[PDB]
UniProtKB/Swiss-Prot annotation:
GO terms for molecular function: rRNA binding; structural constituent of ribosome. It comes from the Eukaryota. It is found in: Plastid, Chloroplast. The lineage of its organism: Eukaryota, Viridiplantae, Streptophyta, Embryophyta, Tracheophyta. Its main location: plastid. Component of the chloroplast ribosome (chloro-ribosome), a dedicated translation machinery responsible for the synthesis of chloroplast genome-encoded proteins, including proteins of the transcription and translation machinery and components of the photosynthetic apparatus. GO terms for cellular component: chloroplast; ribonucleoprotein complex; ribosome. Keywords: Chloroplast, Plastid, Ribonucleoprotein, Ribosomal protein, RNA-binding, rRNA-binding, Transit peptide. Component of the chloroplast large ribosomal subunit (LSU). Mature 70S chloroplast ribosomes of higher plants consist of a small (30S) and a large (50S) subunit. The 30S small subunit contains 1 molecule of ribosomal RNA (16S rRNA) and 24 different proteins. The 50S large subunit contains 3 rRNA molecules (23S, 5S and 4.5S rRNA) and 33 different proteins. This is Large ribosomal subunit protein uL6c.
RNA sequence: GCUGGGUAGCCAAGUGCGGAGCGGAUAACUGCUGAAAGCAUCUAAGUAGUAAGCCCACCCCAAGAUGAGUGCUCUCCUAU
């Protein structure tokens, strides 16, 4: 009954499929990844472009785990090819996010500017000093480091100050009790 | 006997020193990816921040730790 799982997995152009025993070796054009799979879930390669994954109705991983697994390789395979990106609008008085080599320098106005270290493989675009957008590969490992920048100053309820999700509509409560 | 001084020792009111870690796992909490439930959701797989609290680390003891550990070195002649 999985309405995401019933949909076949779109395998785009230049998808390097391979097996490491139980893992699906997702190594497209830009690099490499790793995805492990249980004994109750055999991922089929049905010899017709598309891909669908097997169930095993003893527990209800047949219901639920195929939400993760049949959407993991949706984003893992695309992720190596294109890459998923998350966006950051910084708003306020003197909010620079310049980049000196490896680390960032977010000078939000604490005292010492905040040097968020750029991790192993990922790279980050920088629209201006005023705005940033983090490119990458996967959806998971990009989102954590993206969320760490949003953590330093959340979107605040009076001026909409500090960091912002570009998509998110954060409220502005009536400041000064006006 | 009563006073006035006082080296060493012992004493403080005197002199030194101390409380430190970008180490680990957590609690409330904030999350990322993400179904069940085409959407959502911090969770059911996985994972990140994250406390004078908990565990290592500091300092003293410690193999009677009968589970008696490990290392280096010395000694085994006779009435002595």
């Amino acid at each position: 009954e999985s309405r995401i799982g019933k949909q076949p997995i779109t395998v785009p152009a230049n998808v390097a499929i391979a097996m490491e025993g139980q893992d699906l070796k997702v190594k497209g054009p830009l690099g490499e990844l790793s995805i492990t799979y249980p004994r109750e879930v055999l991922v089929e390669k049905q010899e017709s472009g598309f891909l669908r994954v097997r169930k095993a109705v003893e527990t209800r991983r047949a219901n639920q785990m195929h939400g993760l697994f049949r959407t993991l390789t949706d984003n893992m395979v695309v992720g190596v090819s294109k890459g998923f990106e998350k966006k950051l609008q910084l708003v306020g008085v003197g909010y620079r996010a310049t980049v000196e080599g490896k680390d960032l320098i977010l000078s939000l106005g604490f005292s010492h500017p905040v040097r968020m270290a750029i991790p192993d493989e990922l790279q980050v675009k920088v629209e201006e000093n005023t705005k940033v957008t983090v490119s990458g590969r996967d959806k998971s490992v990009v989102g954590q480091f993206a969320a760490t920048i949003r953590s330093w100053r959340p979107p605040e309820p009076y001026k909409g100050k500090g960091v912002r999700y570009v998509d998110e509509v954060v409220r502005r409560k009536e400041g000064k009790a006006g």
